[PDB]
Design a protein around this nucleic acid. Structure first.
Ligand SMILES: [Zn+2]
Ligand SMILES: [Zn+2]
Ligand SMILES: [Zn+2]
Lengths: 392, 412
DNA sequence: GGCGACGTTGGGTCAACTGAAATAC
DNA sequence: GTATTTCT
RNA sequence: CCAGGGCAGUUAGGUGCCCUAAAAGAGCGAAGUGGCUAACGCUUCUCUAACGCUACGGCGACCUUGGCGAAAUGCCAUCAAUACCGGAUUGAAACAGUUGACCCAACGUCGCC
C-alpha cells in the first residue's frame, strides 16, 4: 500500500560501508532469478493443486509445506526467510488471481526479473542512519547496503520508520539493472480537523498548505470546454435554453470544487480555510465553500485579493510561472532533500539527491500567499514599507 | 512473395446468405466470441507453460500436447468451431515459441491475451469472400456444429463488411477469385477502442514484377528534427520531407488526455463511483488518436520513400539501424517488399561525420548541423545540407565496411 | 510539485505470422 | 460438401 | 480564441447534418482493493446523444490532385479555408495489421514532505 523506493548504491559486508562486497550485482541478479524461478514453480504447484478436484487433494498446510520443500530443493542458495516470503507472496497472488485463472481471463502468473523482488520480513531488516549515508541492515551474516535518499519526504519517512512499522521489504530490479529498495510501512490511523485558495480566469482554483508542500490544481478543462461549447452553440443558433443551462452549470460547478477543497482540507490534517474574496459567479463559489466547509467545522475567512499574485511566497517580496527578482523563486533549481539553491546540475553536492527546477506557477504562488495566516497584517507591514497602496 | 492486410469494418451480422435476417444482439455476440477466444488462448498458453516447465522425461509428446490443447479449447467453449480452435492453438504456440527462451530465463511475464478487443482467428478454408449485389459479405464460420444444434441457428455468420474504396474493391475482387491472384489468410475479428468491429484479411500476394535495377541504391537518413531525407547513389537527384505538426499533435492529444483525467477529482458522482471504465469512458476516444496518427504519418513518409525509388528505378533502399523510427523503417521494408525492392540495414555510426564526396572522417562537423562543409576536399565549400550529406553517404552499397575500414586507420 | 506503492492506459521497439492434408459427419 | 481433428 | 463527439470503410485534418451540462446521469453484482457489506481509477459490466431518404427492410453519404524537383528550399496549374484585403496567405494521403513481450511516459487513489 504505502511504500517508498530507495535507489541503491553498493553492498558492504560490514555496517561501516568500508569493505564492499565485490560482484554484488551479479549475486543479487542470480538470487532474484532463483526467487522468480521458485515463485513460478510454486505457482504452478498451486495451479495443479487447485485444478484437481477438491475431494482428491491434500490439506492446505501440507500443500504449503510441499511448496516450501520444493522451493528449498530447487534453489538451495535462497535463504529460509526469502523462500518463506516467496511462498507467502505466491499464495497471496494465487488467492487474488485464481478466479481469473479459472475463468481464463489471464494466463499463468509468473515473476519476471523486474517484478520479482527479494522479499524479506520486517523482523530481519533494520533501518540505521549514519550521517549522510543511509544503511539497510538485512540479514541474508547480515549484509549492509548503501541507500541514497533523493527527497526530503523520503528522508522523513525513512527516519520515522527507523525510530512507522516496517512492512515486507522488497528489492526489485529495472531494465538498466538498477536495484530499487522499496520499504513498505504502516501507520496508526488518526483523523484531524490552515490553507488558502487562489483564483484565476480559466485555471479555476489552486490550493497550498501553510505547513505542508502539498499541492493541487483544479485544471479547468471542464470549464473551458463548457464555455467553448456554449459559445459555439450560441453562434450556430444565431446563424440558423443555453443560457439557463450555463447558469445551472455555474451553480453546480461550485459544489464540485467546494467538495474537492473540503476533501483536500480534511486530508493531510487542515482545519482552517483562508479563502479569497471577491464572467463567473465568484460570490456563488464563495457561499458554497463557506457553507460546505462549515459541515466539518472549518471556518472560512475572506481576504482582499490585492497583491496576492505578485507577492513571493518564500521571501515576501512584492514586485510589479511566477519568478520574483529578489530571490529568483521561479528560475532557481533546488535539491528536494536540502532545499539549498544550486546554479546547475541534477545532483546535489550537499546531499546527492534529486535537484528539481522550481515549477512555481503563478496560481500556486498566489494560493500559498493567500494561505499565509494573518495576511492583512503581513501585507500592511510590507506594501506600506515599499509605498505600494492597497485598499482596506 | 509478400503479404498485406485488408481491414474491413463490420456493418452488421446476419444468419442468411441474402442478409435478410440479422442477429439483434450481434455486437455482444462478437464480444462474447472474442472473450472466449482470449480465454482459450490463455488456457493454451498456460498448458504450454506447464508442459515446457516440466522435465522432458515427464512429458507427453508435443503432438499429444497440441491435441489435448485443441480438445480443451473445443470443450471449454463449445461455441468455438474447430477452425477457430486450431487457429487459437496455433497462435498460442507461436507466442510460446517466440517467448520460450526468455520464459526459460524468467525475463518475460507469461503472455496473456487481453480479453478486451481480443482477435478472433479463423483459417482461410472456412470463411469465403462473396459479393451479393453491392453488399460485400464474408461467410465466416464462427459457430460450432454443436452450438448450431443446441441453439437452432446455423454455423455460418454472414458479416456485411464495408468495402467502399476503389483500391479496397480491387483487392477484394482479386482475392475473391483465384483464377496474379491473392490468397486468403487467417481472418481476424478485432475491435477498436471505440467499439467498432473489423474483419482483417491478411492476404499473401505475389511480389510485383517491376523492372528495378538493383545497382541503383537510395539511402534514407532519419534526423532529429528533420524527419527524413533521401538521396540516390547512382544519380545526383534526391529528395526530402519533414514533419509538420509531427509532435504538436502528440503534445495536444496528451495535454487533452491529462486535462480530462485530472477532471475526475472534481467530476460528478457518476464517474467517481462506477468503476475505472466509467471513469476512462471520456478518455476512450483519445485511446488511439496519436497512436494511429503515428501510422498515418509513417505511411505517408514510407510511401514517398518507396515511390521515389520506383520513379528513379532504384531497386535497393538503405536504412540506418536504430519518434517511431523503427515503425517507419518497418513500413518502408514492407511497402518496398510489395514493389520488389530489397532493403539493406547498415550501422549509421559516423555516417554523418564521413563526407559524402571524399569519404574522409572529421570531428568538427558535429557542431555544424544546419549545413555540411568538408574542410579537406571542399565539396560543400564550392550549399549542401547535412541531412543530404548523410543520405548521399549512406546511398552507396557496403557502407558499414567502409566506415569500419576508415575508422581503423583514423578517427577510431 | 516531487519522492514512491498499487493499478490502469497511452506512446514507443521487435519479431513472427498472416495453413494444409486428412478425416469424421 | 461441410466441419473437425491433426500435422507441421 | 468558434470545443468534444456520432455517421460518412480506418487513421489525421477538414467537410455535409446532428447531439452535448458524455470533463454527464443510472442500474445488476461481488471477480478484487477496503470495512459477510458495498466506499472505490470496484466489475467479462451494461444502458444512457448524434447523417439524409425510407414505405421500415434497406439504400446512399464527400476532399486531402497531377508533374518539376542535385531539396522542407519551394514552382507550376487544381481544390478547401481565412476573425486578411475578386486578389493575397495557409494546407494539399496514404492505407499492413494482429499478436504478445519489454521499455518509458502519463493519469486515479493512497502515505509523506
Ligand atoms: Zn522571492
Ligand atoms: Zn541537497
Ligand atoms: Zn569531403
Amino acid at each position: 500500500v504505502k511504500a517508498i523506493k530507495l535507489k541503491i548504491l553498493d553492498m558492504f559486508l560490514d555496517p561501516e560501508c568500508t569493505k564492499q562486497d565485490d560482484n554484488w550485482r551479479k549475486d543479487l541478479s542470480t538470487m532474484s532469478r532463483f526467487c522468480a524461478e521458485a515463485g513460478n514453480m510454486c505457482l504452478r504447484d498451486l495451479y495443479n493443486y487447485f485444478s484437481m478436484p477438491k475431494e482428491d487433494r491434500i490439506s492446505s498446510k501440507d500443500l504449503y509445506n510441499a511448496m516450501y520443500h520444493k522451493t528449498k530443493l530447487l534453489h538451495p542458495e535462497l535463504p529460509g526467510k526469502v523462500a518463506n516470503q516467496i511462498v507467502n507472496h505466491a499464495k497471496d497472488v494465487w488467492k487474488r488471481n485464481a478466479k481469473l485463472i479459472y475463468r481464463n481471463q489471464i494466463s499463468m502468473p509468473t515473476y519476471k526479473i523486474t517484478t520479482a523482488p527479494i522479499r524479506l520480513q520486517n523482523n530481519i531488516y533494520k533501518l540505521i542512519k549514519n550521517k549522510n549515508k543511509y544503511i539497510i541492515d538485512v540479514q541474508l551474516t547480515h549484509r549492509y547496503f548503501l541507500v541514497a535518499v533523493r527527497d526530503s519526504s523520503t528522508r522523513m519517512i525513512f527516519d520515522r520508520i527507523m525510530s512507522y512499522t516496517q512492512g515486507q521489504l522488497q528489492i526489485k530490479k529495472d531494465h538498466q539493472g538498477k536495484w530499487y529498495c522499496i520499504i513498505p510501512y504502516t501507520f496508526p490511523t488518526h483523523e484531524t480537523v490552515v490553507m488558502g485558495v487562489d483564483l484565476g480566469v480559466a485555471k479555476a482554483v489552486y490550493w497550498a498548505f501553510n505547513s505542508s508542500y502539498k499541492r493541487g490544481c483544479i485544471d479547468g478543462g471542464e470549464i473551458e470546454h463548457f464555455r467553448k461549447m456554449i459559445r459555439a452553440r450560441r453562434v450556430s443558433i444565431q446563424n440558423q435554453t443555453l443560457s439557463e443551462k450555463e447558469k445551472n452549470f455555474r451553480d453546480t460547478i461550485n459544489h464540485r470544487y467546494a467538495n474537492r477543497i473540503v476533501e483536500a482540507a480534511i486530508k493531510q490534517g487542515c482545519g482552517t480555510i483562508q479563502i479569497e474574496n471577491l464572467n463567473w459567479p465568484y460570490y456563488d463559489l464563495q457561499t458554497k465553500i463557506v457553507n460546505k466547509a462549515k459541515e466539518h467545522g472549518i471556518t472560512v475567512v475572506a481576504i482582499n485579493p490585492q497583491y496576492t499574485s505578485q507577492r513571493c511566497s518564500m521571501c515576501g517580496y512584492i514586485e510589479k510561472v511566477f519568478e520574483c527578482k529578489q530571490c529568483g523563486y521561479g528560475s532557481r533549481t533546488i535539491c528536494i532533500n536540502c532545499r539549498h539553491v544550486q546554479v546547475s546540475g541534477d545532483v546535489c553536492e550537499e546531499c546527492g539527491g534529486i535537484v528539481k527546477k522550481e515549477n512555481v506557477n503563478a496560481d500556486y504562488n498566489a494560493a500559498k500567499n493567500i494561505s499565509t495566516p494573518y495576511i492583512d497584517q503581513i501585507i500592511m507591514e510590507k506594501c506600506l514599507e515599499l509605498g505600494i497602496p492597497y485598499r482596506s
